[PDB]
Amino acid sequence: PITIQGKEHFEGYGSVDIQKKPTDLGVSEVTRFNVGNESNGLIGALQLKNKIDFSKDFNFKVRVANNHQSNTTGADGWGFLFSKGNAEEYLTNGGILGDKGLVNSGGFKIDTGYIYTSSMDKTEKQAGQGYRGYGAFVKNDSSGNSQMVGENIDKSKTNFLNYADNSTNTSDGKFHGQRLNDVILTYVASTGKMRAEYAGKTWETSITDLGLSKNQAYNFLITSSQRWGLNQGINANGWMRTDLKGSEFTFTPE
């Protein structure tokens, strides 16, 4: 097993860049998704240069900050995606932040954007004026169709979370999604179980329910998008930012 930190372990694809000295995040630089403007939205990915050996454990701690933006014009969310496919395929097919994407792939999403035609968004009651979002494990089948899998393991069994707020006390010690916060993703290869922790909540699934297998090696993609595939343009800042310097990724490469 290795442990790595830093953006140089990833190859960037699509609508992604580096933001130097963000005045609102408290870090000296940050990787920034959803920059620019296109008529069918924005889509971007960072692909880990090594593949992950799924016969061995992994633990990821990813520091992410969500856009402080309406969920009808802001970013679609974060998708932490495992696939035999690659980032260039993701850029034209989608990942796990919508209704369809890269086939036979799966991972965990932090959903920050309301796609009013999507069944998963409707059942999660994402429509509203607040910063309404939700977390979930998602699997794409052999035709690429996305389905929620696993479940939330808090008492609520609910997926809902506020992905940003209007607090003037962001350093009070509590969760404020527009600042940098830990996404923890843990996998125990012996048992097949994958767990995600974010915003004080916890989810769990098996890699079997994600459509993945133990005796394989997968590409790992940190992905985001903004209104991608919806033919609605880009009409607000939807920056989604991750501090890869302060993140850590432990896994067995393959």
Name the site residues for Ca ion (rule: CB under 5 A): 111, 113, 115, 121
Query: How many beta carbons lie within 10 A of that of residue 247, not counting itself?
Result: 22
Contact 164, 67 (CB under 8 A): yes
53 or 111, CB closer to Ca ion?
111
CB of 224 to Ca ion, least distance (A): 12
Q: Who contacts 251 (Cβ-Cβ below 8 Å, separation ≥6)?
A: 1, 2, 50, 52, 53, 56, 57, 58, 59, 60
Between 89 and 111, name the residue whose CB sits nearer to Ca ion: 111
Q: Which residues make Cβ contacts (< 8 Å) with residue 104, sequence separation at least 6? A: 83, 84, 85, 140, 141, 142, 211
Alpha helices in 23-171 (DSSP H): 87-93, 119-123
Report the residue number, 74 or 251, with the smaller CB distance to Ca ion.
Answer: 74
Closest C-alpha to 16, from 32, 37, 40 = 32
- Beta carbon of residue 101, minimum distance to Ca ion (angstroms, whole number): 13
Give the C-alpha separation, 247 to 227, whole Å. 27
Minimum CB separation of residue 147 from Ca ion in Å reads 14
Nearest to Ca ion of 51, 132 (CB atom): 132
CB of residue 26 vs Ca ion: minimum separation in angstroms? 28
Q: How far is CA 4 from the centre of its chain?
A: 19
Is the separation of the CB atoms in 88 and 46 below 8 Å? no
Nearer to Ca ion, 10 or 137 (CB): 137
Per-residue tokens: 150: 């696993």
- Indicate the helix (H) or strand (E) that contains 5: none
User: Shortest approach of Ca ion to residue 217 CB, angstroms?
Assistant: 30
What would the two tokens of residue 37 be?
Answer: 């403007």
Closest CB to Ca ion among 89 and 121?
Answer: 121
Nearest-approach distance from CB 102 to Ca ion, in angstroms:
17
CB of 180 to Ca ion, least distance (A): 22
Q: Specify the residue, 86 or 93, whose C-beta has the smaller distance to Ca ion.
A: 93
